[PDB]
Amino acid sequence: ECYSDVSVHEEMIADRVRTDAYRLGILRNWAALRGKTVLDVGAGTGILSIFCAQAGARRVYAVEASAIWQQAREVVRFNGLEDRVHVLPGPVETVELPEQVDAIVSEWMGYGLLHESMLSSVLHARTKWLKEGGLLLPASAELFIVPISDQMLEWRLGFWSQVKQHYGVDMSCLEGFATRCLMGHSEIVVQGLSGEDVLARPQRFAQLELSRAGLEQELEAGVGGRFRCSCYGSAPMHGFAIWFQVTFPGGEKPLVLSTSPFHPATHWKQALLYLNEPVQVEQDTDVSGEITLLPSRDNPRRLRVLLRYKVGDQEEKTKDFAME
């Protein structure tokens, strides 16, 4: 059965924000790519590799570990590009290229940036295959956090109080239940918010420069930091959202692919960290904390988040989460 193969790749190519950012991010580097060689780490259907050929690349190595490489090979053949784009199956960690490359392109980002991401493969490929001074696309990533009020959640929390109006049965007694169940767990929830859900100015809490020596070791130890912000007005705060952006250098201004609730929606949505129950905030309520994103103990590719936070005059609280 290959319906998950098709659905995953459909979703990514259908994500126009993602796919256009890569097309433009790559095309805008034509001066640096024209006549040069590129490695596409995790080429999928081949689309980014073809973008590189459009940008002028002499040779693209499109490396793909899953069965979709069969489709990339077809797409490259079909578009008449087999003498410029070479689709190679298997993991990038063991692929054998005939030369070092001038550039690496990859779409490696996972939910919450780092959940089941391909970052460690991209960093492996950079060390092994990228020439000194070579180009990395994108070049860096940044992580943001902000307090939020989730309207979808608020509706679900209130649902049980609406039963009586429709069916003559009062289930408002189940709000505590719904709250414990929907907020009291320790799972990271992937869900798309809008700008009205954001309760304060978003705060950058980490910056990942992919050329930085030692980045792999930082990721293993945990990336993150402190944050502080001030709320805009009265709202029921449900927790925090985290999201990311990645940046492609220009030839020119950098191009930024953002997953913020204020920007066009992507398939990454945002990663939500719910408090155990809602807390009321007001204009100028201070919200602060420290957050760390790191490998889960049992599966090193699954994302765990350590959070300590303080809302207003409430005491500091710890809540640690895992993607599940």
Which listed option, a second copy, ligand 37H, none, makes contact with residue 178 (CB within 5 to 8 Å by class)? a second copy
Q: What is the DSSP letter of 302?
A: S
Q: What is d(CA 176, CA 181) in angstroms, rounded to the nearest whole number?
A: 8
Output 19 or 245, the one with its CB closest to a second copy.
Answer: 19
Q: What is d(CA 241, CA 202) in angstroms, rounded to the nearest whole number?
A: 9
Minimum distance from CB of 153 to a second copy (Å)?
A: 11
Residue 212 labelled as part of a binding site: no
Structure tokens given for 157: 């929390």
Q: What is d(CA 287, CA 133) in angstroms, rounded to the nearest whole number?
A: 41
Burial (Cβ within 10 Å: 0-12, 13-18, ≥19) of residue 191:
middle
Q: What is d(CA 167, CA 153) in angstroms, rounded to the nearest whole number?
A: 22
- Whether the link from the prior residue into 89 is cis, omega within 30° of 0, is no
Residue 154 labelled as part of a binding site: no
Which listed option, ligand 37H, a second copy, none, makes contact with residue 2 (CB within 5 to 8 Å by class)? a second copy
Does 116 participate in catalysis according to the annotation? yes
* Residue number closest to ligand 37H, CB atom: 42
Phi/psi of residue 25, nearest 5 degrees? -55, -40
Q: Interface with a second copy by CB under 8 A: which residues?
A: 1-3, 5-6, 10, 13-14, 16, 19-20, 23, 45-47, 50-51, 54, 71, 74-75, 78-79, 156, 159, 163, 166-174, 177-178, 180-182, 185, 187
Residue 93 labelled as part of a binding site: yes
Given 11, 74, 99, 116, the catalytic residue: 116
Binding map of ligand 37H across residues 13-52, x = CB under 6 A, - = no contact = x----------------------------xxxx-xx----
From the list 223, 8, 201, the residue with the least C-alpha distance to 113 is 223
Q: Pick from 37, 121, 140, 247: which binds ligand 37H (CB under 6 A)?
A: 121
Q: Pick from 39, 59, 64, 305: which binds ligand 37H (CB under 6 A)?
A: 64
202 touching ligand 37H, by CB under 6 A: no
From the list 68, 102, 103, the residue with the least C-alpha distance to 87 is 68
Minimum distance from CB of 265 to a second copy (Å)?
A: 17
3-state secondary structure of 4: helix
268 touching ligand 37H, by CB under 6 A: no
Q: Residue 183: how many CB atoms within 10 A of its CB? A: 19
- The CA–CA distances, whole Å, from 112 to 94, 115, 128, 245, 281 equal 27, 6, 27, 10, 25
Could you give the angle at the alpha carbon of 273 between the alpha carbons of 270 and 275, nearest 5°? 145
Minimum distance from CB of 160 to a second copy (Å)?
A: 8
Does 107 participate in catalysis according to the annotation? yes
From the list 152, 55, 148, 113, the residue with the least C-alpha distance to 301 is 113
Residues of each annotated binding site = 9, 18, 42, 64, 93
Q: Which residues are catalytic?
A: 107, 116
Residues of each annotated binding site for S-adenosyl-L-methionine = 9, 18, 42, 64, 93
Which parts of this chain interact with ligand 37H (CB under 6 A)? Answer: 12-13, 42-45, 47-48, 63-66, 68, 91-93, 107-110, 118, 121
